[PDB]
Amino acid sequence: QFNPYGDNGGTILGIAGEDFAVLAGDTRNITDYSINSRYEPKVFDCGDNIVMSANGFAADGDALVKRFKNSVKWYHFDHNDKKLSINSAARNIQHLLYGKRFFPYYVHTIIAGLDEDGKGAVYSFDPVGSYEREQCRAGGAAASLIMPFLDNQVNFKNQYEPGTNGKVKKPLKYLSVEEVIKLVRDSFTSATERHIQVGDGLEILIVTKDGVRKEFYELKRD
């Protein structure tokens, strides 16, 4: 019987800073034990300083990103070229996803940008459009490998102030864009070593008030 879903592998990572936000993804596209492409981007500038990735089934992910980019275009037409705020985008994507509640988009969606106060924002969605704002979210094949590391290095979870008998937590604080990209690069090189579906290349889209910048880094090709 025809199965309308597939797994194209890949893993994505969204981190929110103080005055910036990054959305990273590996560039490897797979089916079973074969490599389809060593460079197939799945992190996209959608306009209005919103970056998006729909990781999982690449056909559903391409479809959703295409529909959202089109949603941004028609928002400009219908509302006098008004900028689509990240929170407004997030609610729109919920409706796009929940639209297919009984034949879902088989993707984990993450968007990143700045909120209306200019502070870094990341929103993560389940396949049917439940969403939440987060400082830190990994999605896809190697999410389970990356996420507990971020908990420890970003949110400083389980780290206590040396000498305080484990009574005083290590204090939360915003990381620089430089310090975040280090954690992203180390997250993906680690995932590349221990997950067969992760490797080939890493593409990071950084979102500041100045716009959307790209950085590319090689990963192991085995």
Partner: protein, 204 residues
């Protein structure tokens, strides 16, 4: 109805400079329900340490079995079994039950009393040996531990540093697994002394 993920729990082992570390969570559950916060998964036969994750009845049964076999080994050989030899015994004993296996993920840790060489090894439920310089992981949060270990681990750590690394590897892995946690124990193993520390972690 997957025997390896009914009771839950994790073991991790790591090598350092003239030392090894092995650590486990203390949770035993019946699926969603937490039953015990004192279920240690690390046993020792002389100076050879064995961690076992998976079905708890098999964890208990294999401990009782390897105590039996290492007790008889010592009486006949007139010396304590070494990690390398014990690894082969775990492998033999598991593959003996090839078509009716123990639902376990055992981890061996210890220092060879002759050569002083740090040794760790891991097995699948039918006894395929994974011998590793760096680290071995087992249990329901094995994916989480692989991620933590592959990023945190560096070679030739001193006992006091290795303790911090393996502790942070286990705690942060167990916090991203529903069926792991409820307390943790870390064994730091030097050539002729062994310290055992209980970690403070969230109890949910």
């Amino acid at each position: 109805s997957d025997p390896s993920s009914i009771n839950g729990g994790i073991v991790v082992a790591m090598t350092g400079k003239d030392c090894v570390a092995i650590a486990c969570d203390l949770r035993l559950g019946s699926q969603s329900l937490g039953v015990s916060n004192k279920f240690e998964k690390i046993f020792h036969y002389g100076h050879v340490f064995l961690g076992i994750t998976g079905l708890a009845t098999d964890v208990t049964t294999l401990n009782e079995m390897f105590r039996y076999k290492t007790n008889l080994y010592k009486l006949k050989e007139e010396r304590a079994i070494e990690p390398e030899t014990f690894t082969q015994l775990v492998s033999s004993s598991l593959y003996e039950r090839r078509f009716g296996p123990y639902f376990v993920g055992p981890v061996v840790a210890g220092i060879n009393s002759k050569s002083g060489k740090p040794f760790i090894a891991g097995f699948d439920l039918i006894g395929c040996i994974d011998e590793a310089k760096d680290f071995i992981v087992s249990g329901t949060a094995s994916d989480q531990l692989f991620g933590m270990c592959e990023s945190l681990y560096e070679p030739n750590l001193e006992p006091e540093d290795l303790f911090e690394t393996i502790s942070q590897a286990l705690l942060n892995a167990a916090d991203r697994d529903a069926l792991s946690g409820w307390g943790a124990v870390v064994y730091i193993i030097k050539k002729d002394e062994v310290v055992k520390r209980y970690l403070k972690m969230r109890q949910d």
